[PDB]
Design an enzyme around this catalytic site. Structure first.
Site, PDB file in Angstrom:
ATOM      1  N   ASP A  30      75.587 -16.807  -5.743  1.00  0.00           N
ATOM      2  CA  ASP A  30      75.040 -16.105  -3.936  1.00  0.00           C
ATOM      3  C   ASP A  30      74.881 -14.884  -4.744  1.00  0.00           C
ATOM      4  OD1 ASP A  30      75.685 -16.205  -2.306  1.00  0.00           O
ATOM      5  OD2 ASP A  30      77.729 -16.268  -1.627  1.00  0.00           O
ATOM      6  N   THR A  31      73.549 -15.161  -4.034  1.00  0.00           N
ATOM      7  CA  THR A  31      72.690 -14.394  -3.518  1.00  0.00           C
ATOM      8  C   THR A  31      73.227 -13.339  -2.561  1.00  0.00           C
ATOM      9  OG1 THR A  31      71.076 -14.769  -2.916  1.00  0.00           O
ATOM     10  CG2 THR A  31      70.545 -14.289  -5.253  1.00  0.00           C
ATOM     11  N   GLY A  32      73.896 -14.187  -1.011  1.00  0.00           N
ATOM     12  CA  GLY A  32      74.362 -14.001  -0.080  1.00  0.00           C
ATOM     13  C   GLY A  32      75.738 -13.410   0.561  1.00  0.00           C
TER      14      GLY A  32
END
Ligand SMILES: CC(C)[C@H](NC(=O)OCc1ccccc1)C(=O)N[C@@H](Cc1ccccc1)P(=O)(O)[C@H](Cc1ccccc1)NC(=O)[C@@H](NC(=O)OCc1ccccc1)C(C)C
Lengths: 99, 99
Positions: free
Chosen positions: A25-27
């Site tokens: 996950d980049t968020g």
């Protein structure tokens, strides 16, 4: 690998002797995992996302092998419905987003 | 663009006459944007994240120019703190996780 996002970006991770699938996950600034018995001392901390905030246990200097790539970082443990590998670890395995 | 993750992956988007900055998020199934003014009928939807469940106005067929690439899809508008470009549009601009 090169992971397209037609399906959730899930990978196998090996942490504290256990095998788990976790979301790339980049968020997520932080890595937050489902509750497991992870050995050691843990500071309290709290995080937010949508809906609110949850209380998590901060474990620091935990080794975690994400897809065979090893990394060592802080791992938060708490009531999360999916395990999450955030940018604090994704940068150690060399992950880039490309388009 | 090749985007490393040392910083939050924010890109500019032009949606409904307005300029915004949003998070490229591989951990969001959907796109959720800050409460804003957008034309159309909407249907109530509810999304879950960590901490809990928010109620959002769901919009289908909205054009979003993400990082100067155009794409059309369902956009949820509601009480988030950061706008998120989830996987339903990330796959339209061709985005990939790479490690
Ligand atoms: C994982 C957390 C470490 C991360 N939070 C975080 O980085 O906190 C930053 C912050 C928040 C508030 C103030 C200040 C700073 C986080 O919550 N990230 C979500 C995006 C976000 C929210 C707030 C602030 C910044 C960024 P995310 O990574 O996209 C989160 C990952 C996830 C968590 C739980 C469950 C699933 C998936 N997705 C989401 O929350 C999306 N939910 C979603 O895709 O799945 C629906 C679902 C699945 C399973 C069960 C219930 C509901 C949502 C955007 C619609």
């Amino acid at each position: 690998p090169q992971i397209t996002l037609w399906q959730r970006p899930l990978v196998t991770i090996k942490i504290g002797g256990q095998l788990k699938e976790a979301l790339l996950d980049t968020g997520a600034d932080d890595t937050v995992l489902e509750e497991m018995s992870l050995p050691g001392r843990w500071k309290p901390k709290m995080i937010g996302g949508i809906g609110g905030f949850i209380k998590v246990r901060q474990y620091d200097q935990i080794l975690i092998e994400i897809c065979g790539h090893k990394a060592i970082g802080t791992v938060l443990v708490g009531p999360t419905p999916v395990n999450i590998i955030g940018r604090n670890l994704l940068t150690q395995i060399g992950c880039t987003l490309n388009f």
